[PDB]
Amino acid sequence: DQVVIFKQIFDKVRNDLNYQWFYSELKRHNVSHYIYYLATENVHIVLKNDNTVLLKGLKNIVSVKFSKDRHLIETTSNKLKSREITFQEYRRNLAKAGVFRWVTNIHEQKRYYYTFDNSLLFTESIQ
Structure with a gap:
């Protein structure tokens, strides 16, 4: 199952x-964009024009807080920039920043961070 391949990549990369x-x-499979929900660890990988891959991990749900702040995002990416810390912690601070929709649109070279109310919190180039 193609879902297994995608999930395994994320399972490994987190640590x-x-x-x-x-x-x-990513660029070799996800030619469009994947919508990562930190609320359920579920990911909607919408490929080029192929199909949507749905990943399911960390079955607990509600790891996100409705506290939408843009500075917490940039501070966390700055931490990732320097020491890279750990991908799991990176997303923990992002969940604390009210990032419900991790929308990485490789097709446009943007990584969009949306809150539940689909407001754009922040965005960065994927590199």
Whole structure:
């Protein structure tokens, strides 16, 4: 199942932190955008024009807080920039920033961070 392949990449990268193979397979599979829900650890990978891959992990739900702040986002990415810390912690602070919709649109080279009310919190170039 193609869902298994995608999920396994994320399962590893959360703690492994290798970005080359991660981003390589990203552009080599996800030619459009994936919608990552930090609320359920569920990911809507909408491919080029192929199909939508739905991942399901960390079955607990509600790991996000409705506290939409843009600075908490940039501070967390700055931390990732320097030490890279851990991908799981990176998303923990993002969930605390009210990021419900992790929409990485590779097709446009943007990573959009939306709150539940679909307001644009922040965005960055995926590199």
